[PDB]
Design a protein around this motif. Structure first.
Motif, PDB file in Angstrom:
ATOM      1  N   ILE A 513      61.093 -18.111  15.307  1.00  0.00           N
ATOM      2  CA  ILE A 513      61.458 -19.186  14.389  1.00  0.00           C
ATOM      3  C   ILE A 513      62.950 -19.148  14.076  1.00  0.00           C
ATOM      4  CG2 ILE A 513      61.206 -19.884  11.956  1.00  0.00           C
ATOM      5  CD1 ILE A 513      59.131 -21.120  13.699  1.00  0.00           C
ATOM      6  N   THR A 514      63.511 -17.952  13.852  1.00  0.00           N
ATOM      7  CA  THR A 514      64.940 -17.843  13.568  1.00  0.00           C
ATOM      8  C   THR A 514      65.782 -18.295  14.755  1.00  0.00           C
ATOM      9  OG1 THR A 514      64.206 -15.832  12.439  1.00  0.00           O
ATOM     10  CG2 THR A 514      66.551 -16.382  12.327  1.00  0.00           C
ATOM     11  N   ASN A 515      65.348 -17.962  15.976  1.00  0.00           N
ATOM     12  CA  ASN A 515      66.030 -18.449  17.172  1.00  0.00           C
ATOM     13  C   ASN A 515      65.928 -19.967  17.299  1.00  0.00           C
ATOM     14  OD1 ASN A 515      66.513 -15.776  17.619  1.00  0.00           O
ATOM     15  ND2 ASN A 515      65.308 -15.618  19.508  1.00  0.00           N
ATOM     16  N   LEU A 516      64.763 -20.538  16.964  1.00  0.00           N
ATOM     17  CA  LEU A 516      64.587 -21.988  17.039  1.00  0.00           C
ATOM     18  C   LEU A 516      65.488 -22.719  16.046  1.00  0.00           C
ATOM     19  CD1 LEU A 516      62.876 -24.583  17.888  1.00  0.00           C
ATOM     20  CD2 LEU A 516      61.426 -23.979  15.942  1.00  0.00           C
ATOM     21  N   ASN A 581      67.936 -23.044  26.547  1.00  0.00           N
ATOM     22  CA  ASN A 581      67.752 -23.727  25.270  1.00  0.00           C
ATOM     23  C   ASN A 581      66.418 -24.461  25.217  1.00  0.00           C
ATOM     24  OD1 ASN A 581      70.359 -22.800  25.134  1.00  0.00           O
ATOM     25  ND2 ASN A 581      71.316 -24.830  25.187  1.00  0.00           N
ATOM     26  N   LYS A 582      66.016 -25.079  26.332  1.00  0.00           N
ATOM     27  CA  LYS A 582      64.721 -25.750  26.401  1.00  0.00           C
ATOM     28  C   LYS A 582      63.571 -24.755  26.295  1.00  0.00           C
ATOM     29  CE  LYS A 582      64.202 -28.732  29.712  1.00  0.00           C
ATOM     30  NZ  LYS A 582      64.575 -28.717  31.153  1.00  0.00           N
ATOM     31  N   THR A 583      63.708 -23.585  26.928  1.00  0.00           N
ATOM     32  CA  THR A 583      62.680 -22.552  26.829  1.00  0.00           C
ATOM     33  C   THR A 583      62.574 -22.004  25.409  1.00  0.00           C
ATOM     34  OG1 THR A 583      63.348 -21.978  29.083  1.00  0.00           O
ATOM     35  CG2 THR A 583      61.746 -20.542  28.001  1.00  0.00           C
ATOM     36  N   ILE A 584      63.717 -21.803  24.744  1.00  0.00           N
ATOM     37  CA  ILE A 584      63.719 -21.347  23.354  1.00  0.00           C
ATOM     38  C   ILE A 584      63.093 -22.400  22.443  1.00  0.00           C
ATOM     39  CG2 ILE A 584      65.283 -20.875  21.409  1.00  0.00           C
ATOM     40  CD1 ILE A 584      67.086 -19.497  23.667  1.00  0.00           C
ATOM     41  N   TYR A 585      63.416 -23.677  22.678  1.00  0.00           N
ATOM     42  CA  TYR A 585      62.857 -24.768  21.885  1.00  0.00           C
ATOM     43  C   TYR A 585      61.349 -24.895  22.082  1.00  0.00           C
ATOM     44  CZ  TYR A 585      62.581 -29.418  19.766  1.00  0.00           C
ATOM     45  OH  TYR A 585      62.269 -30.492  18.965  1.00  0.00           O
TER      46      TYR A 585
END
Length: 2003
Positions: A513-516, A581-585
RNA sequence: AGAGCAAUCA
RNA sequence: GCAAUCAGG
RNA sequence: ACCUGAUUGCUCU
């Protein structure tokens, strides 16, 4: 009149003429026979001559009718029907004269042979008989001789009666004998019911005249004889004559005069007559007299056969009948034989079968004194045929039946001793079975252990495993000062990863969640440099309501700023970001669980079954968790430290609440009398300001509103960024679920910038939900959990600014130490830093309570607060739930902490009550539950706090599937309990009477006790049976047309059965073309997909389905194979209730029909509308199976056209229902009631047939309830509840104070009772047993009543709704393979419906059940008074399921408690009521029912010693939670009704400005946005420069609630409009007061002079600002008619107001519900698809030509069937007529309205308001009529014109007015000057429920009628041509509406009604013949412009008196 | 993660 | 959340 | 057939 009667007199003319000629011959023979033996004149000569002239009169009459009626039978139109009716009337009064003459002839003939011959008189009366008997007693010397002083007071105390005897005589036996009189009557009839009726009538009114009259302390009849002798001859066989004579002494039912044998025996031994037959009579020829008497009866048969019974001896009231099933009887002529097994269940050893049958079918002779004639004949014929059908020899005559039933009530009376020993035995048996719980803590532990047994391993000590603490909502205080917050967060989140992942109390999701959030804040979001601005959203006006931002790609441009692609300046997506970024999202969305990977969903669904089913995922905490208590105390202290950090001083909620509470003295007119209490309200307002209560709830509203609007047309790869008005609050509202489905909702992440000063306290606060936090500069950044809200929960968060501040106000008033410290300290010295520890702790607990009540969102709070609803029964006497309710019905569902505070508060109150006007708290020293708050001033405050926190909660928080499965588990379990208890099988039918209903326990009644009790109740209640039947058939609209009834007309749901036929399935499969796979659309595709899905699931069901419904099944099977193998179809997997959601209904109906074939027929109920289905039933009655345009219009012209009756519709329903159709009529649908509780109640949709039958069932007992004084379901509003409980307690307390004077011993008790299961546990065959005992009915509709209940109970099955049914079938298919009671009543879930048997459907039987509950308490009264040792008196109050029973005891009291095994009289009252009700199949709940010695709790609002605890908190909760959501002015009106009711029920000094603020915030926040934002009204008025100041803007124009509290208490919710209009009339017409204004107005040619002055000022340009107000509001009044949406024809509308709604937004009208509506199908059929959504112009032209040809269908309520069904067709013509249909209700409409307010509704709301106000600023010509009618409406208000001077000149205090100050100022100065200026009272203190005194609807109802007439004429003429200012000489109606709309039509017809007072009787012919337009649209309204009325305000009872 | 405790929404 | 298409496994 | 990625549409059948 009757044309059938006018025809029936014609063909009987030959026999009538023969009988008349025979009558003439017999009368002349009688005259010759009398004259040849008496040559002198005789008294018979005059009546014989009168008989002769009347006989030749009827001879000429029948000759003329026979001559005239030759052409009427051939249908000739030249027949004088009115002349024939007048001749029929002349015939009948001449026959009445001959009947009276024949009676007088009989009397003068018999009067010669009397042993006491009476003198010949003409006019006779009981009055002159009694006067002459009294003066003869005074004058003549006898044994019973009256004295001169005793002469006068007999006539003084005497009460006259009205009856007509035939003669009277005074007789002396000897010289020294007693004087006496005998009443003579001469009646002739074949059966002795005339004798019984006349003799009992004479007995009853003589007894009622001489009951209270006493002579020398003795009864009058004991010394002074009064005799009644009635002589009847039988006019058959040998003319037998008899005399029935008896002496009146006492009550007839307790007299020896009751038996007929004693009447004829008292006739014997005195020899009144020497005559056995009239042939014995001297001077008369026997054959002549016999032929003449039979000759008279051979016209008495004919005349009474044709003309009926129009006798009218005492006006008779003409009891009509119910004809078709009239000849049948309840046994052996109904559909099934059930009365025989009812009788076999009823028969005991002591009371036999024939006696039970005789009493049951012949208990009408007890009420025989006041029935009409031939009702006796119908009921006795029904009794005779019922006895014949039950194989018992019937009793031949009413006399023998009466003697029989007198001996039978003698043996019947010895049954209540058996019931008394039965209830004593049951009390002593229940004493030895109950278990005494030792302690409250052990009761809590036993409840927790039982809950742990029900749900294993639920309680855990791991406090980190609970749910979210401070709901899903956080608004921390902030310190700095739209996009600025966002770039502040961006500069916060650009820092490195120093984040600290938080333990819950003491983590890959937290990292993810913090990464998102850091990705979405760094690499996704940008700023507002772009200038494309926001996009405005329109509607589509095809399905009007669906707001679209349009797919035209200009809205979906998506923009750019580098790499972000923002829309709407806050939403941005990801499309071209990096793959990391897409994978993290996407990992963020996976942790957020928005978008389910189906692999993970299937894996979880398999894993939970594998894990759990080899051994409910609830996580719980215990009630005694001191670790949780310490954690919650830290939560409290940290919350108080957190809430004080706000430095904002201006806001939106702050503005309205500071206006309404900073200076609330403007709400009064005496501001100087109360100074410290206004200062206390100001101190509470300042505490809310400094503590940021208003600010915090402003972010609550912005939170909820932006979070609702944050679900839009975006996809899963986008997110909106939401900002409130806070300087550091921000949400990341991602892609949601619903906005229109009610699913999970919108996920979001909350971020905060709480600094280091409040960092640690914030960490204690939100520890359960803090995911990560990190340090940036001098601040800390906090990230919260992924969070969801449903749409109802977002509305619950949206009601927070109406919820939280009024919580703070009421709780801080009710907190004793806080309130007294607020009185001690000053407003400029109150601060957060200036309390002691105790008051500060009170403030912490009270902020916790305010926040935690305004933000309830979880069902745990529902559970604990229901528990606290039933935790207040402790402090009053025998409670029996200080341990038992906690053990049984307490629900430990504590899913978190912050409700453990409520649990600890109630447990502290429980422990303090265990440790040991009524004032509790000074000596108890107890503890308040929500606000701890010790030293309780008054128990009223505690109940107000608790019940407010109960009632101020939202409604529909329940999950749909869980709520419906529990609500269907309840009746299935409660019916399987009976079925397994009494031993019936599931598959077999009801088998209604197994004779186990004989005084057993579970499901049983006593039987014989019940029938004796019901006969006694009907004897004691039903008086004047004929009048009661008359007002039943008048007031309950039984002979009125069925659409005239509001219960059968109002737009509710009925849920008729509707399935597609299996034959239609067969030919839909057969005509399918496989070459047209891409051509199928709609129905055929739906059936194909249903067949494909059912083939995919169960092949053999289709195999047997096609085998049993088709001959060539192989063709259909190979066609199914060819259509699955085609590959052009879209198959589906198990997609549960979404398969219901995203598909046509036809698919799931054919899927369920082809899935659920087990040798039976399956049906699915679809919820249709009640009015639409009644339209369908009217079509089915009148034989329009399909609608024809000409067929309806060809018949039904005017009131003489075709109509129907409700009874005719009812028998048509039974005619259609008795056929073998599978009995789909008695199918009930269960739906979820929104009960504001954790344990939900339920609502029911019974079919329209069942609703009509059950309306008859219920509302023929409405007048039985109305005649019952001890019953409170026939209530005149909600006032009768408190008023009649007040009569109970006041009368009982007066009775006890009377019995405490000079008595050995007396005791008092009360019981407030709530029955356990009033519907499920109650037997229903007592209703079948009890309808037959009704004397109101006769056999012929009574048999219809029994057959109604019998079919309604035997053939009743509830049906599972389809979505939860397929959920249950999913559970069957993949998890269970076994089931609970639903799956045992249903054969393994292969049927969508299961049978319930005698659980009568709750809420539909409200009058019958309450009437029989009152009958049960009357049975209790006569059972308990059979106690020979003591004497008892009871007074009971009865509601459906609710009871308040009092008791007063005297005698050997202590010994009677020893026999009743009780410690006290309340304990014996509780146990005796429990046992007695348990013998009536009424299960009293021992938990939620308490017996007191001083308190009464009937439904609510407990009254103590005659003082009502006021309970204004229900209105305080209704002011903030429930609004109408139709318009802004409508919402303000509806909440102002509850404001007025709140003031009327008593409210303290500091809470009413907050209530004004709360209703203002609710209305403004929902509809027209409160100031500081767009769509304000004060801002728009200031922008347009209207001369009105801010505090008198009209509410329909968007103004605020500005009425003062005295007129809002007396006048009503229209007082604001009336006050501002009175102010502007006083300002323009320059005067000083209302009396001077009306004195200036009362002279004519004055308003003309001021209007000419205004015209001259407008011409010159000298419009001073006082006059600018005047032009604006009279233009508002004059153009408030048309405005927008005036196409509604609402008659009888609500809100008692003056102006209209002006602007109403269109509701969402989908095409699906429209096309589902059958009346819209008929509309689209009779007018084709050109009007479904140039030839449409001519279609609407035809529809408006037939508008204008018959506008009675659209103006007033329908008269005939040419006024109703085509009105239902016309209801969809034009928009704003289709905007009144919605299945949306309260909950999902507010989100639509807040989405509509800031949208284009094409213009928009503010554009529409601006152009409307700009148009009202003009001076549209000839407004003088409007000004005159406005001034007349203001002046004519009598209550307003009486309130205003006595409010302006009210003396403040003293002289027994205001000697007290504790919240009695809004008692005294609200009502005592008004309630002494309006009819006087002795009151000072009370509680108030007023009448409809301000019935100001006499102008707004014709405003709506003139609006609809004006606008339908406007559609007509604007369609007939363009540019309509003056017409081109069309027809007369067009020319008259041209005259109308050339000027102001509404105001000219108001002036026209002001002069004229024509008021034709509305016959729909003459009113059209006089004049068309102006009278048809003024006087059709059933009234005119007239005066209002004032009443005495109905002060219910006195509250506690302080002086 | 969240809503609920009928094995349900995401 | 759904609907279909286009690919991959 | 069943799951991931790219497109547009429904946002109350």
């Amino acid at each position: 009149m009757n044309i059938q009667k006018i025809q029936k007199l014609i063909e009987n003319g030959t026999t009538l003429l023969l009988s008349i000629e025979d009558c003439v011959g017999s009368n002349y023979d009688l005259a010759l026979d009398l004259h040849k033996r008496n040559s002198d004149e005789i008294p018979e000569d005059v009546i014989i001559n009168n008989n002769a002239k009347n006989y030749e009169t009827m001879r000429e009459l029948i000759v003329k009718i026979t001559a005239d009626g030759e052409g009427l039978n051939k249908g000739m139109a030249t027949v004088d029907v009115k002349k024939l009716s007048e001749m029929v009337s002349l015939f009948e009064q001449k026959y009445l004269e001959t009947e009276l003459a024949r009676h007088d002839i009989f009397g003068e003939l018999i009067s010669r042979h009397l042993r006491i011959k009476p003198k010949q008189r003409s006019e006779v009366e009981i009055e002159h008989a009694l006067r002459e008997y009294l003066d003869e007693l005074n004058k003549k010397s006898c044994i019973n001789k009256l004295s001169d002083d005793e002469f006068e007071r007999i006539n003084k105390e005497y009460v006259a009666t009205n009856a007509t005897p035939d003669n009277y005589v005074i007789y002396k036996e000897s010289k020294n004998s007693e004087l006496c009189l005998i009443i003579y009557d001469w009646k002739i009839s074949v059966d002795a019911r005339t004798e019984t009726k006349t003799m009992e009538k004479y007995y009853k009114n003589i007894w009622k005249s001489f009951k209270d009259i006493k002579v020398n302390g003795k009864p009058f009849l004991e010394d002074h004889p009064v005799f009644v002798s009635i002589v009847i001859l039988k006019p058959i066989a040998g003319m037998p004559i008899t005399v029935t004579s008896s002496r009146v002494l006492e009550k007839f039912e307790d007299s020896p005069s009751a038996l007929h044998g004693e009447r004829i025996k008292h006739a014997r031994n005195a020899k009144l007559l020497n005559i056995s037959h009239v042939g014995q009579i001297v001077g008369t020829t026997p054959t002549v007299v016999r032929n003449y008497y039979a000759n008279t009866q051979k016209i008495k048969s004919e005349v009474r056969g044709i003309l009926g019974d129009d006798f009218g001896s005492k006006d008779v009231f003409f009891s009509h009948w119910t004809s078709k099933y009239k000849e049948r009887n309840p046994t052996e002529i109904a559909y099934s034989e059930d009365i025989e097994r009812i009788i076999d269940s009823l028969v005991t050893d002591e009371i036999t079968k024939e006696e039970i049958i005789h009493f049951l079918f012949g208990n009408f002779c007890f009420h025989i004194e006041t029935m009409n004639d031939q009702h006796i004949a119908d009921k006795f014929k029904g009794y005779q045929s019922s006895c014949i059908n039950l194989k018992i020899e019937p009793k031949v005559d009413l006399a023998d039946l009466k003697d029989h039933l007198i001996q039978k009530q003698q043996i019947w009376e010895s049954l209540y001793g058996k019931h008394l020993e039965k209830i004593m035995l049951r009390i002593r048996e229940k004493k030895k079975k109950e278990k005494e719980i030792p302690d409250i803590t052990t009761a809590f532990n036993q409840n927790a252990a039982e809950y742990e047994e029900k749900y294993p391993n639920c309680f855990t000590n791991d406090l980190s495993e609970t749910k979210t603490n401070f709901s899903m909502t956080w608004s921390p205080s902030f310190e700095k000062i739209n996009n600025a917050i966002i770039n502040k967060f961006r500069e916060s989140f650009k820092s490195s990863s120093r984040v600290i992942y938080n333990s819950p109390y003491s983590t890959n999701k937290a990292r993810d969640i913090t990464n998102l959030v850091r990705l979405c804040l760094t690499e996704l979001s940008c700023d507002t440099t772009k200038m494309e601005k926001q996009e405005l959203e329109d509607e589509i006006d095809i399905n009007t309501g669906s707001i679209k931002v349009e797919r035209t790609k200009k809205s979906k441009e998506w923009n750019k700023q580098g790499s972000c692609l923002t829309r709407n300046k806050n939403e941005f997506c990801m499309k071209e970001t990096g793959r990391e970024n897409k994978t993290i999202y996407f990992k963020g969305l996976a942790v957020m669980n928005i978008g389910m990977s189906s692999k993970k969903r299937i894996l979880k669904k398999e894993e939970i079954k594998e894990r759990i089913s080899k051994g409910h995922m609830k996580k719980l905490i215990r009630h005694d968790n001191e670790d949780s208590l310490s954690w919650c105390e830290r939560i409290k202290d940290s919350l108080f430290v957190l809430h004080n950090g706000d430095i904002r001083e201006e806001g939106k909620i702050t503005s309205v609440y500071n206006n309404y509470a900073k200076n609330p003295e403007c709400l009064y007119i005496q501001d100087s009398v109360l100074k410290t209490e206004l200062e206390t309200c100001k101190k509470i307002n300042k505490l809310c300001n400094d503590l940021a209560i208003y600010h915090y709830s402003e972010d609550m509203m912005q939170f909820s509103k932006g979070l609702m609007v944050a679900d839009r047309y975006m996809t899963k790869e986008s997110f909106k960024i939401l900002t409130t008005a806070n300087t550091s609050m921000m949400l990341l509202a991602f892609k949601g679920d619903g906005m229109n489905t009610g699913g999970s909702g919108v996920p979001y992440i909350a971020l905060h910038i709480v600094d280091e000063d409040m960092s640690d306290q914030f960490n204690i606060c939100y520890t359960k939900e803090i995911y990560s936090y990190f340090r940036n500069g001098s601040n800390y950044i906090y990230i919260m959990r992924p969070q969801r809200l449903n749409q109802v929960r977002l509305l619950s968060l949206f009601k927070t600014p109406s919820k939280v501040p009024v919580c703070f106000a009421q709780f801080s008033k009710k907190a004793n130490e806080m309130e007294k410290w607020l009185k001690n300290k000053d407003i400029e010295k109150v601060n957060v830093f200036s309390m002691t520890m105790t008051v500060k702790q009170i403030l912490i607990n009270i902020v916790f309570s305010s926040v935690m009540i305004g933000t309830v969102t979880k069902l745990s709070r529902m559970g604990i607060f229901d528990f606290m609803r039933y935790a207040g029964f402790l402090p009053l006497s025998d409670y029996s739930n200080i341990k038992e309710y906690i053990r049984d019905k307490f629900d430990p569902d504590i899913t978190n902490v912050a409700d453990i505070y409520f649990v600890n508060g109630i447990k502290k109150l429980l422990f303090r009550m265990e440790d040991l006007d009524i004032i509790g708290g000074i000596t108890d020293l107890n503890i308040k539950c929500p606000i701890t708050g010790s030293t309780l001033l008054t128990l009223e405050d505690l109940y107000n706090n608790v019940y407010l926190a109960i009632y101020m909660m939202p409604k529909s928080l329940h999950n749909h599937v869980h709520n419906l499965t529990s609500l269907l588990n309840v009746p299935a379990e409660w019916e399987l309990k009976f079925r397994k208890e009494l031993g019936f099988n599931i598959f077999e039918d009801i088998y209604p009477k197994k004779a186990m209903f004989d005084d057993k326990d579970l499901f049983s009644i006593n039987g014989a006790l019940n029938v004796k009790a019901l006969s006694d109740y009907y004897l004691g209640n039903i008086e004047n049976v004929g009048l009661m039947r008359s007002e039943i058939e008048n007031k309950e609209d039984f002979l009125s047309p069925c659409y005239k009834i509001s219960t059968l007309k109002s737009s509710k749901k009925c849920s008729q059965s509707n399935i597609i036929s299996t034959d239609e399935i067969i030919e839909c499969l057969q005509n399918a073309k496989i070459q047209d796979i891409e051509n199928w659309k709609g129905n055929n595709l739906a059936i194909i997909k249903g067949l494909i899905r059912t083939y995919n699931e169960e092949k053999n069901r289709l195999v047997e389905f096609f085998e049993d419904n088709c001959v060539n099944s192989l063709y259909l099977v190979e066609k199914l194979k060819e259509i699955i193998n085609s590959g052009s179809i879209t198959v589906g997997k198990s997609v549960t209730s979404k398969f219901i959601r995203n598909n046509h209904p036809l698919t799931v109906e054919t899927y369920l029909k082809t899935k659920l074939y087990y040798r039976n027929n399956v049906t699915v109920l679809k919820s249709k509308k009640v009015s639409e289905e009644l339209y369908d039933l009217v079509k089915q009655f009148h034989n329009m199976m399909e609608i024809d345009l000409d067929s309806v219009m060809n018949l039904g012209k005017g009131t003489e056209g075709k109509k129907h009756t409700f009874l005719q519709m009812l028998e048509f329903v039974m005619s259609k229902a008795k056929n073998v159709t599978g009995s789909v009529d008695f199918l009930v649908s269960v739906f979820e009631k929104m009960q504001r509780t954790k344990t939900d109640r339920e609502i029911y949709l019974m079919s329209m047939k069942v609703k009509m039958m059950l309306y008859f069932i219920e509302h023929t007992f409405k007048h039985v309830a109305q005649s019952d004084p001890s019953e409170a379901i026939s209530i005149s509003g909600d006032n009768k509840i408190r008023a009649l409980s007040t009569l109970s307690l006041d009368t009982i307390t007066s009775y006890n104070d009377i019995l405490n004077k000079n008595s050995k011993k007396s005791r008092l008790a009360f019981l407030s009772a709530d029955q356990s299961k009033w519907s499920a546990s109650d037997l229903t065959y007592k209703y079948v047993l009890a309808i037959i005992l009704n004397p109101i009915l006769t056999t012929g509709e009574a048999s219809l009543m029994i057959e109604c209940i019998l079919m309604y109970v035997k053939l009743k099955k509830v049906c599972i709704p389809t979505d939860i049914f397929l959920n249950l079938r999913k559970a069957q298919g993949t998890f269970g393979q076994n089931e609970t009671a639903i799956g045992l009543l249903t054969k393994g879930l292969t049927t969508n419906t299961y049978p319930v048997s005698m659980n009568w459907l709750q809420g539909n039987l409200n009058y019958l059940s309450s009437v029989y509950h009152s009958c049960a308490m009357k049975a209790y009264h006569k059972t308990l008074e059979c106690y020979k040792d003591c004497d008892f008196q009871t007074r009971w109050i009865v509601h459906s399921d609710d009871n308040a029973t009092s008791l007063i005891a005297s005698g050997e009291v202590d010994k009677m408690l020893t026999d009743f095994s009780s410690s006290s009289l309340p304990e014996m009252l509780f146990r005796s009521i429990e046992a007695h009700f348990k013998s009536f199949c009424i299960t009293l709940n021992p938990k939620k029912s308490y017996a007191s010695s001083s308190e009464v709790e009937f439904i609510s609002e407990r009254i103590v010693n005659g003082a009502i605890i006021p309970l204004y908190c229900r209105h305080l909760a209704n002011c903030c939670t429930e609004s109408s959501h139709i318009s802004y002015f409508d919402d303000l009106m509806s909440l102002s009704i509850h404001v007025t009711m709140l003031l009327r029920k008593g409210c303290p000094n500091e809470v009413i400005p907050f209530a004004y603020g709360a209703v203002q915030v609710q209305a403004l926040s929902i509809y027209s946005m409160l100031p500081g934002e767009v769509n304000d009204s004060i801002r728009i008025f200031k922008k347009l420069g209207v001369s009105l100041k801010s505090n008198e803007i009209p509410t329909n124009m968007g103004g605020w609630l500005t009425s003062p509290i005295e007129p809002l208490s007396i006048l009503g919710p229209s007082s604001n409009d009336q006050i501002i209009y009175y102010n502007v009339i006083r300002d323009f017409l320059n005067k000083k007061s209302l009396e001077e204004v009306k004195d200036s107005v009362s002279s004519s040619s004055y308003l003309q002079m001021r209007f000419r002055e205004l015209k001259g000022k407008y011409e010159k340009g000298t419009l001073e600002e006082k006059d600018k107000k005047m032009i604006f509001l009279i233009n508002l009044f004059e153009k408030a008619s048309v405005s927008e949406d005036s196409d509604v024809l609402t008659i009888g509308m609500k809100f008692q107001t003056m102006l209209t709604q002006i602007i109403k937004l269109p509701n969402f009208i989908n095409e699906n519900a429209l096309n589902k509506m059958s009346s819209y199908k008929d509309f689209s059929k009779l007018y084709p698809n050109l009007k479904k959504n140039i030839a449409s112009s001519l279609e609407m032209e035809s529809v408006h030509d037939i508008m204008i040809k018959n506008p009675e269908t659209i103006l007033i309520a329908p008269l005939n069937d040419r006024d109703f069904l085509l009105s239902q067709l016309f209801m969809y013509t034009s928009p704003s007529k289709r905007n009144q249909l919605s299945n949306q209700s309260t909950e999902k409409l507010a989100l639509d309205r807040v989405l509509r307010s800031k949208a284009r509704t094409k213009m928009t709301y503010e554009e529409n308001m601006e152009k409307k106000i700009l148009e009202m600023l003009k001076f549209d010509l000839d407004s003088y009529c409007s000004f005159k009618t406005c001034v007349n409406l203001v002046i004519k208000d009598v209550n307003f014109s009486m309130l205003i001077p006595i409010l302006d000149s009210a003396y403040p205090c003293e002289s027994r007015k205001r000697d007290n100050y504790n919240f009695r100022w809004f008692q005294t100065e609200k009502w005592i000057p008004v309630v002494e200026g309006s009819p006087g009272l002795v009151v000072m203190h009370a509680v108030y429920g007023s009448n409809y005194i301000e019935n100001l609807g006499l102008k707004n109802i014709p405003l709506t009628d003139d609006s609809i007439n004006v606008l339908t004429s406007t559609f007509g003429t604007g369609l007939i041509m363009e540019d309509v200012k003056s017409l081109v000489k069309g027809k007369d109606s067009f020319e008259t509406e041209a005259f109308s709309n050339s000027n102001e039509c509404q105001r000219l017809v108001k002036a026209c009604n002001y002069m004229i007072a024509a008021q034709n009787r509305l016959l729909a012919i003459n009113t059209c013949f006089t004049r068309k337009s102006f009278p048809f649209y003024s006087k059709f309204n059933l009234g005119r412009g007239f005066i209002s009325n004032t009443l005495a305000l109905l002060s219910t009872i006195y509250s506690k008196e302080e002086s």
